[PDB]
Amino acid sequence: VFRRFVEVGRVAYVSFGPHAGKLVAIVDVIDQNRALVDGPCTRVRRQAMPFKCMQLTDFILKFPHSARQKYVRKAWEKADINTKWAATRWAKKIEARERKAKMTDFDRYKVMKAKKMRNRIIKNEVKKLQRAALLKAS
Template identity: 80%
Template sequence: LVFKRFVEIGRVAYLSFGPHAGKLVAIVDVIDQNRALVDGPCTGVKRQSMPFKCMQLTDYVIKVPHSARQKFVRRAWEKAQVNEKWEQSNWAKKIEARQKRAKMSDFDR
């Protein structure tokens, strides 16, 4: 078992629970072994400290320097086309199908 996704500056993560569950963020800085400073300029998540337990790391990495400003993170996010790549991924499609199925009633099935 070889790990391919590491916590690094610029790594895009999916928030699995909490107030911003279901949104993507970029890791801007690592605070300690439990928390990171994240920013989601294109997903509506303000820059904040967040525990790693709330995040699931994705395969996407954007090129940003250590503690980059939000404007720079937004530019790198749009240049890397993270939202478009995410929408085409199998992971996003599974989440969308799960949400669609959960909203169905007995009559819709």
């Protein structure tokens, strides 16, 4: 059973291609494997874009199937898609990946030193929990 559908108004995430990592909205369906998309508030012109480079999200904003740039923009700003996407765990994971890639040598040394102690402490408390469970089960 399916939960995401390709209908007029659903916003989508561009996985690869020129406008990768930007959100577009389905404006009209051209054919089996081509869609008309438009990002008014996110630096994407109106263009045909294949379905293979997109991937749907759980957001739908309403406009007519042939509406204009102004109307798509006002629907976007009314829906607050930028803030909602920023809140989304999907975008949180994306930006965490970006930050980890951007991490430098000094940051790598800091992270190594910190996680050394974090793992040490958590392992000690795990041993404590194991001993508690064993004694209450014996």
